[PDB]
Write a protein that binds this DNA or RNA. Sequence first.
RNA 1: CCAUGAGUGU
RNA 2: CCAUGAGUGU
RNA 3: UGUGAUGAAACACUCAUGGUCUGAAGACUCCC
RNA 4: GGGAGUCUUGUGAUGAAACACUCAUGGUCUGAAGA
Lengths: 122, 122, 375, 375, 227, 227
Amino acid sequence: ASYVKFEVPQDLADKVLEAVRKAKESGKIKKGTNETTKAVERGQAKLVIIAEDVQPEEIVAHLPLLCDEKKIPYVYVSSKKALGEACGLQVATASAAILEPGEAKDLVDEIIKRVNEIKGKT
Amino acid sequence: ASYVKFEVPQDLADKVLEAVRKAKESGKIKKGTNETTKAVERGQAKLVIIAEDVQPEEIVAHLPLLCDEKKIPYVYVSSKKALGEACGLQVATASAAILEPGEAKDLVDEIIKRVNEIKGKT
Amino acid sequence: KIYLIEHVIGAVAYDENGNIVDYITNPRDLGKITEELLNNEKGIPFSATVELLKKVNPQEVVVENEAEVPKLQALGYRVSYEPYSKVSRIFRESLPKVAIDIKFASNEEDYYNFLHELSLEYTRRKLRSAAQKRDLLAIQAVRAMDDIDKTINLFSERLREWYSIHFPELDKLIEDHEEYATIVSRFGDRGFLTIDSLKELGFNEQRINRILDAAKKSIGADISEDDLSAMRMIANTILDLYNIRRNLNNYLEGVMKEVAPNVTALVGPALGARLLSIAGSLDELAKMPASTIQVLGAEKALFRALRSGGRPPKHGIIFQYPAIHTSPRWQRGKIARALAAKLAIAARVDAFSGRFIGDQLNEQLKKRIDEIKEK
Amino acid sequence: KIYLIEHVIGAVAYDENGNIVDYITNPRDLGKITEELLNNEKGIPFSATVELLKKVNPQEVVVENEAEVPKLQALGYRVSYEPYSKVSRIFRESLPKVAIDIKFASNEEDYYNFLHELSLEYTRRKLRSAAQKRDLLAIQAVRAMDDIDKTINLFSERLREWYSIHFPELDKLIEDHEEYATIVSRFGDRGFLTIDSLKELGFNEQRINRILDAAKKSIGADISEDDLSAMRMIANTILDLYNIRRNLNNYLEGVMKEVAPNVTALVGPALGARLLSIAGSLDELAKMPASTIQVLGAEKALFRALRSGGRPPKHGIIFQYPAIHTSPRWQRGKIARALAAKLAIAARVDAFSGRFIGDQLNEQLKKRIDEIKEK
Amino acid sequence: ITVKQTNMENIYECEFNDGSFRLCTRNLVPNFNVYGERLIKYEGVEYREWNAFRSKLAGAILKGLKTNPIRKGTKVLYLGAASGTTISHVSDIIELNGKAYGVEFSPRVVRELLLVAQRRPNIFPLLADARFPQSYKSVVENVDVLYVDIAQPDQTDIAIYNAKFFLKVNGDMLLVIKARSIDVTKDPKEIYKTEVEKLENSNFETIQIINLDPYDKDHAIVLSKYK
Amino acid sequence: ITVKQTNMENIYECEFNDGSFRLCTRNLVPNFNVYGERLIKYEGVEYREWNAFRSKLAGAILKGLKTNPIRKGTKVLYLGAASGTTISHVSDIIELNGKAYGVEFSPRVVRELLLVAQRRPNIFPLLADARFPQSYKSVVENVDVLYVDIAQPDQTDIAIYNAKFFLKVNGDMLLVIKARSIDVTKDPKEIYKTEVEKLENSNFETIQIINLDPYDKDHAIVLSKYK
RNA sequence: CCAUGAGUGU
RNA sequence: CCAUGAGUGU
RNA sequence: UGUGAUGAAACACUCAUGGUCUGAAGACUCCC
RNA sequence: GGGAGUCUUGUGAUGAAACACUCAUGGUCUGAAGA
Ligand SMILES: Nc1ncnc2c1ncn2[C@@H]1O[C@H](CSCC[C@H](N)C(=O)O)[C@@H](O)[C@H]1O
Ligand SMILES: Nc1ncnc2c1ncn2[C@@H]1O[C@H](CSCC[C@H](N)C(=O)O)[C@@H](O)[C@H]1O
């Protein structure tokens, strides 16, 4: 895919999915591309998760632009089916956002700091 | 004059000027063509008095028209200076109106009923 | 004493009790009755009424209309009127019936058939005399004029926003809309501008070079001939409308000097027409107090003051008068109050058919204005 | 570890302490610096930076921009970025001075003289790259069309009111504005109407007779050629406008398929353009959620509901979509929501340069619409 | 769909495809509508949908008009007939037997009144000023009902004036009170009261007073009997 | 007429023909006006009339701005320069020694900003997005005053981002808070408290809080010192 | 700007 | 519809 | 059916009629 | 400060919120159920 800016190791990708699940239970998340869009526009999201297997590509391509504008960090997962079914859906999702980490605070803070390292940030 | 619809005798004409005068003291009048016009449009006036020497005449030609629409009776006097100097002005007036007769009700009632007779009304 | 009734039915005489003394039935002809009803408005008696006033030879007659009274006095009788007399009611109470009795129609069926088509033809006639009034065309003219005025501005504002994609520097360099319009029309691409074509509009050479320098150094976008020609449609239309506006103003001037010269003398055709449009007719402007003419066109502002007891408008559409909007703020109130006074007189001398007297009216006004400005 | 700076001044290397390890001064040339400033936006390093990264041989280098990092990793170095580092600050604290020290200019006087003209020239360049965007021409075109749409209607309502002084029955006889205008334009006086001229407009033989009879029995006013020609000016402008609209429509269609084929595929050129006009650009349209695109053009309705907690509008300019306004009130909500959803997909594939996919989108849409209607 | 008679002559209600209830009258000129109203056939008879929001009479009914003095074969004087919206429905009601005289002084509007009055023998158009009943005096007869819906500051006085001309004794007058066309400054509820008193001093017997809201804002209609 | 210095550098007041008092600045480019402002000569020196209804800075001054960090020779970063109305007056103040870098990302408007910046060596125009200071990083220096007047929901966050880039320690930031462009629903007074708090968390030292009303509705400006 | 009655366009 | 900045026509 | 289900006030205009400011003061000069 | 006149003025002195448009920026519904 071309809207995927960097490479996510599957250990990270899995630790991502887990952070989402804890946030459904203890915090507040958003599911779907349109609500993720509003979550970035509104500055509610702390972490934005976008799928790498979206068809067609352009559906979620605006999220990198939007997220850098509002300087909200974003991360990718390999499967959209997995991310949606993580979100508490039995259907896929192209992108989601965590608004309140809750009992994923430590978990998220490590992700947003690891994805910084692979982004070449000091 | 051409805006003068009927013929007013000086005996009647004098009872008018007097009737106006008592209405300044005991009732409410309006002096001037514009205020008279407003008085008829608003239907406040009980009796309309018009001078016979206005120049140019067309200034007050509309009062007969206006008075018939709102069905307010009108009367003529001979001098505009006389009508004004009655009204408590030291300048002339082309037309005036009595809104409230006061201590001239009986005097007015005779005028509005005599001008009916010369108007051929049964 | 005979009570006289006038109707479609003919002309009927009554005694004071309400019994038909004599009658003369009208002809069952749409044409003649319609004309006699129109004529009756001016006071003119029916021809059937004239005959009846001969048949009966009455000492005292009393008619329904006060406008008829002097006409019948000229005819030889002593006449008065009673507006809503008991007799006039009596006739109309029995009007389904007495149409048949005096043989205007055989039955009720085609009395109403006639009266229906009389009414249709009677108002058809009145409908026409309303359309024939000359001030209407004056009004429609200024309304279209104001539509063109408005459109010109909209189109010009659009064109500038649009054409400035290609030549942005041109917008602030040419103040006037028509000028801007002509340039976009004639040339298109900025690189087609030439000294000789531009000298033809009247541009002093100093400005032409500034235009050309701006076109040379333009940070605008290079754009296709399709894109430019798309814009040029609006530019040409703007140019079209300015011409039509100038034509309409000239027409308006023509009709306005015709229908209301004194008002035109005071405020000109456009503003004069504009006031007629607001009043509704020339005769309605005439019946107005100056205090109304002064605030016509400021209704939102006016009733705002009337509901709340706040500050009233000094001026309505009257604001367009040169003396007002050019003058400082404190003088405007008095100029408007003075103008409105004269306008009201002007409207009245105009409507009640006076010949032109605008010269003294203008002179009186400018006298009053000159006094105001010397303080 | 070397901290690297990129500026108009050149490229400077710093240690973590804030001392210039080495520097390579830029050329004092407007043209060349401007280009590298534009290039640096995309990640491309200055040519002065490359020379500098060769002189010093640092194991760990750190730059200001995150876009430069992959470019410099490709050049052989280990590279990262720190956005607002202490070093970058240290550099600019001494920027009045260090222009002279690394000899970019002799004194402070003409560093700013130059830096000014660069700034003027740098944005002048950006001003142009903005104007060269294709979607801007789309927006201005459709905005102007809606300006003409508005004007056509106003002039038409004026003309009917105006012409009906002469020929009132024509007003209710011709529904279409363009048709009505065409009669007044070609004929003028009502007694000039002839059959063949009317067959030429498309009028069926039956209506021609109804029109001709109406003019014959018209209770309108008889009027001069001056009066008529005035009206016909407006009539002719109406027809002009109708042509220009269609020409604008074809122009719009081309641009819309060029700049946004996918969106055009869904809702047509005009409405697509209209949505671009509300968003401001295509790239801004793309970034929108479906829930916003759905109500664009309904800002009065929308912000009322947000302020008062009342009911929101179902649809904005999206309402113009044939399927919606033809449909009953309860289906509209679901159709609009579905359309806006598909529109958002269309916009994004358009903005992020995807090739045409509108066919499947339309198919997907028409499916959902049909599902909705089967209830 | 279902249509059935109401408490009042020639006035009907409709049960609809969905279950809504709208007033209607029997089409005097079948297949022809004066405004945009629905034409409805039920058991092969055509009715005209009577929008209350447009017609003050339909409003007054839907607001509990106790009794309607306008019925089969009634003679009515209708001051301010305008474009003919409301008067076309009373045409349906009085039904050829009755007669309706429409006074209206706005030519721009009588223009379209004509069209309604050609198709309907019930209605006798008159381009005249209701302030001068002498000008149409010579065309009409006396009437049972005086329906007055005119925008005029002295509208009530006009009505009373017309009444003592043409209104049969013990006839009924429906006078529409336009508060905001009498005075936009004064409170509407104040105006309704002061105008009704005008009628009562002029010996009309106030029967019922209806507030037309929400069908017509700042409007009220009075029913009274002339003596 | 009379013109005289005020407590703040290169900012003057006028005694007028009638006796009204209006703000003004020493004209850096005499005989030339950027908006419609009046030109006034007094003792052969020309001043530009500073309309407060247009310039928020003039408003805050007329509303009791304690101290003005903009004076002779001040280096200012100006986010949201717009048409150049306000920035032109700060051009007059800083006076050739000082420099003003004007960020503005709307091309339709930067268009006339160009015109202002041509006649004025004080001003360095930048068509850029104030959310990405990396794009103008390579033109500006660090600054004494960070003037922020941008219509954006995250305007406060943007300012802070720019500050830690270009704002000197112990430098000042003038932050215009646009309530209705932050949230049209919330109370303007709520926004002010929450935005100032944001500044106080990013170790800005709130010096003064001004309400620009009535010159600007639903606006406030903050003066604070960065640490 | 209020009310009433009649209509128009995307 | 709200707020800010730049303008236009009668 | 999260690649958006459910709920849910799209925008621009014309004509006709009525409601349409205040009401007597302002400016100069001459005598001790 | 007291007195005294002159011109303008109810054919209007005094007081007093005329109207119509364009651009640019941001604030731009709901969220898991439906046959
Ligand atoms: N003085 C007057 N004489 C006759 N009609 C008048 C009048 N003043 C106003 N009108 C008319 O009264 C109408 C009021 S609207 C009422 C319309 C009609 N009653 C209906 O419901 O269908 C206006 O159209 C106006 O033209
Ligand atoms: N994110 C952003 N980056 C740069 N400029 C922005 C911006 N968001 C809004 N703006 C601009 O900020 C401006 C605010 S209006 C400010 C007016 C100006 N300061 C004066 O007083 O004269 C607008 O012109 C807008 O184009």
